[PDB]
Amino acid sequence: AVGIGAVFLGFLGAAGSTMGAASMTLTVQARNLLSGTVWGIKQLQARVLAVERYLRDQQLLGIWGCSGKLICCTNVPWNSSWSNRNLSEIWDNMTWLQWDKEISNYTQIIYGLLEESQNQQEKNEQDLLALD
Amino acid sequence: AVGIGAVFLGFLGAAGSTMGAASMTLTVQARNLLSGTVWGIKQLQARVLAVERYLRDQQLLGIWGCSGKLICCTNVPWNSSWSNRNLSEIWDNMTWLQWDKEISNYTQIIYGLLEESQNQQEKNEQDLLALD
Amino acid sequence: AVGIGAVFLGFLGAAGSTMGAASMTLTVQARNLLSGTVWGIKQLQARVLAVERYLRDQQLLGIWGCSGKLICCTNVPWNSSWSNRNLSEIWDNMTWLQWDKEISNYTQIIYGLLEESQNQQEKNEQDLLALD
Amino acid sequence: LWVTVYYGVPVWKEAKTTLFCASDARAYEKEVHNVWATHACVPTDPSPQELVLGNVTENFNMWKNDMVDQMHEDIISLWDQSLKPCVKLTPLCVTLICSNATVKNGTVEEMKNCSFNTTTEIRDKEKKEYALFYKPDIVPLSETNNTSEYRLINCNTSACTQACPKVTFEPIPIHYCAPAGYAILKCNDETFNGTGPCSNVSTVQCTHGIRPVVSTQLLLNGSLAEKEIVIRSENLTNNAKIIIVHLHTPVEIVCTRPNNNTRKSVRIGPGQTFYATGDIIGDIKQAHCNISEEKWNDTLQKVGIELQKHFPNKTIKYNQSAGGDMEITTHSFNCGGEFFYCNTSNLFNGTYNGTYISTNSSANSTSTITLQCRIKQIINMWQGVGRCMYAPPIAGNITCRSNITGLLLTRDGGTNSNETETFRPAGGDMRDNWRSELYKYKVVKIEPLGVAPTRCKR
């Protein structure tokens, strides 16, 4: 929605801040996931391990329709048993680093509720184009 | 679209079904294209052969404006000599595995007819934004 | 849009033409950035030196909102001190190969003025959805 | 106006990379490890065609290229790799008692009949063997009171590995290809000196087939210039630069070893053999090379006129080589297995004053200049490579017939306000053999992300 990029705060400078402050500076952690140089067979693996990881994060966001390095809001209903917390006590004081300790037990079954049906809404868009 | 994902049917469970049923399940075949572990110089090739083949499929769908792992419908006209078959006798009984035997001979020249004019419509959208 | 490709001029055939004529043919240079074969340890790096470069060009365009291989126009103001030239004396006679000789002194800070936060207009769009 | 980015932009930056090898398909019909090209290189194809570009003008340069140094390192490491499974000799550092090799009631002047005690495959037992060794391979042992006891020229500095008889030294052509994201620019100017701007540039993926020919003082089986003889130097003012002359038309040289050698196998240790020369079955004759005299005189007059382009008032003299060790002052090459070291003082003896003399009204149209060659087997070939190799003998007479396409001259020091400015042959650094072939090519990195202003706003 704009041409601009990442901020000068450095690779992990937003760690320890709020969830809203770490909703900014996402571009910097997105930027620093690729590099390359040479120290032989021990380091050549450290080349390809930079790729095998990164495309995996380009898999799932391509699965969910997000398709980038951005905020991607969906319409899967949040089950209240996952956090049992309102928006203001999550976003204004908590950190991502300690929010992951509460959500990481449930991220797999969240992916298990992001599991079943993106392709049929792609088919719904195709039905809206073709039939309608 | 919706913010959901794959199906539970496994990697190739839709093989042998119809084109309608294999127009579902498309996310699973696109999700199992990357993995990583170690058995030395014989297996290191099996790492990079996972990536060199994956990004090529991310090339062409990026060329055609599809830009993802999804249903992507165009407006290039279908020459009738390629199949000489109507819609219902393709999508309701035929399998993708046996449709590829009929379409693979002409797939190269179909991609050749998928090699003319994307760059000029990106210029046309630039004309629609700038001039209009 | 249209799901179609490139031109028959070959890999660098638009070099030496105008900026308008090399605003065509852009698909061809983008398609020939990946290949694969084997000549051992001297060539295996020559495999990954493709991918380690190519995903880098998929990083920056993934950040700037472009997300592909296309024309991507922004709303960042052009500082006049960079070229001091109008549009017709750039686009109709100059070559990209000699435009880069003038612009590459400044491309770091032009990329540098494409910095801080695309993330905030991934937030404002969310402010159009969550709040409005 | 607003900033706008473009992907797929043809913008170049010259850079270093790792180019890889491509060889033609028919060599893959042969067995593995015969030549290094057929073992692992990729199969080339004429599908990446030569594509002429637009109005591009691009700078090229030979003398600080990276392709020639990379090719030199590849040939060093590949030839080192080819000698790993072969026999390392080592029980051949014994004392050799070398008498006269009186081949059928007459002595040979080049070969000694050296007898030595070999350890057999049973390491407590020994047997006496004999072999005929060339005199460049043989050094007298010490200052002791015995003139009949000799030694190999090694064992003082290194231990030589015998070259395997199943691998060949045939120069299969090598195509150097840039990886994906890079391109190879080829300068198509026929009058191209090798340094400066080229106004007719093309883009290729894989270079033309370079013959890895190892040769000093002449260039064999190389590519030919399109319309005129091209004289290349880094700077012609400096005397210490090797002047590479590139001929428009080749001169055919035919080389031969006439005496009918044989091959004799000596089993050294468990299951590995040492191949040496046995008897000479016939009569003793001189190994030699032949060049046509009229064509060589015409070629030297033409090299005179395009040398006189840079030296306008002076005549052109050719002198013999500077002298020294035989590996330096002789035309050293490989005539199908055997390493020839030919004397070139008959070729480079003449002068050109300014007037061209036609080859007509000759004394005889079949007159030939004959060079007399020595043959070696212990090849101190390079450095950092496993620096020596024993070349096993090959049975029968041998002939080879090749084309001279280049010369490696060197101007003498400036003195006496000289009217002639004489030139001598030179060699010893092998990069100049491959720098004369990689003169058209350069490697460039594609930078496809570009920035331009336009009226588009997001």
Place this chain on the structure above:
Amino acid sequence: CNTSACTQACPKVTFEPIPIHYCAPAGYAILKCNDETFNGTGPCSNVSTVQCT
């Protein structure tokens, strides 16, 4: 000693046949024919897909 020189097998390594699973890389699959009357050449009408044999 007439043809080669034998190296002694190390006493700390074993000749025991530990089973080996052959796996295809990512982007490939292994088809297993489940026909019990299968001769070994021809069509199989009961095929499954597996990653590691």
Place this chain on the structure above:
Amino acid sequence: LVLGNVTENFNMWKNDMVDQMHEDIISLWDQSLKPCVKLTPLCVTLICSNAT
């Protein structure tokens, strides 16, 4: 995972899995003998009497 109505051709006698496994077992068995003793001083003359 059992599949649907797929019928697929199989063949043993020109498979590539068996040749690759043969090459792997050859190269792995060669690799396992590299650090071991090569003998070589056992090529001496052996005086062999009856092992009574």
